[PDB]
């Protein structure tokens, strides 16, 4: 695919923790996503979740945040 809903990831395979939904919406959309929100409960715990994040931007995948 070219887009996917998931935890956006930063260097290196680390989710972006969050305190507000807007923080995530901003982070997600400035990276090409349709929108985003803060996930306080999810597959990887607290972290920003993006809707339709372009695939040239990293998402959290199995492994450790390093």
Curated annotation (Swiss-Prot):
Expressed by the venom gland. GO terms for biological process: defense response. Changing residue 45 to A: >47-fold decrease in toxicity to mice, loss of activity on Nav1.5/SCN5A, and 56.7-fold decrease in activity on insect sodium channels. GO terms for molecular function: sodium channel inhibitor activity; toxin activity. It is found in: Secreted. Keywords: Cardiotoxin, Disulfide bond, Ion channel impairing toxin, Neurotoxin, Secreted, Signal, Toxin, Voltage-gated sodium channel impairing toxin. Changing residue 59 to G: 1.1-fold decrease in toxicity to mice, loss of activity on Nav1.5/SCN5A, and 2.5-fold decrease in activity on insect sodium channels. One of its GO terms (cellular component) is extracellular region. Changing residue 36 to A: 38-fold decrease in toxicity to mice, 11.2-fold decrease in activity on Nav1.5/SCN5A, and 43.3-fold decrease in activity on insect sodium channels. The keyword Cell cycle does not apply. Changing residue 60 to A: Complete loss of toxicity to mice, and complete loss of affinity for insect sodium channels. Changing residue 5 to A: 1.3-fold decrease in toxicity to mice, 16.8-fold decrease in activity on Nav1.5/SCN5A, and 7.5-fold decrease in activity on insect sodium channels. Its main location: secreted. Changing residue 54 to S: Not tested in mice, 1.2-fold decrease in activity on Nav1.5/SCN5A, and 16.9-fold decrease in activity on insect sodium channels. Disulfide bonds join 14-65, 18-38, 24-48, 28-50. The keyword Repeat does not apply. Residues 4-66 form the LCN-type CS-alpha/beta domain. Alpha toxins bind voltage-independently at site-3 of sodium channels (Nav) and inhibit the inactivation of the activated channels thereby blocking neuronal transmission. This toxin is active against both mammals and insects, and is classified as an alpha-like toxin. It is active on Nav1.2/SCN2A (EC(50)=139-252 nM), Nav1.3/SCN3A (EC(50)=565 nM), Nav1.4/SCN4A and Nav1.5/SCN5A (EC(50)=195-500 nM), Nav1.6/SCN8A (EC(50)=214 nM), and drosophila DmNav1 (EC(50)=30 nM). Exists in two forms, due to cis-trans isomerization at 28-Pro-His-29. Negative results: has insignificant effect on Nav1.2/SCN2A. Has the structural arrangement of an alpha-helix connected to antiparallel beta-sheets by disulfide bonds (CS-alpha/beta). Belongs to the long (4 C-C) scorpion toxin superfamily. Sodium channel inhibitor family. Alpha subfamily. This is Alpha-like toxin BmK M1. It comes from Olivierus martensii. The lineage of its organism: Eukaryota, Metazoa, Ecdysozoa, Arthropoda, Chelicerata.
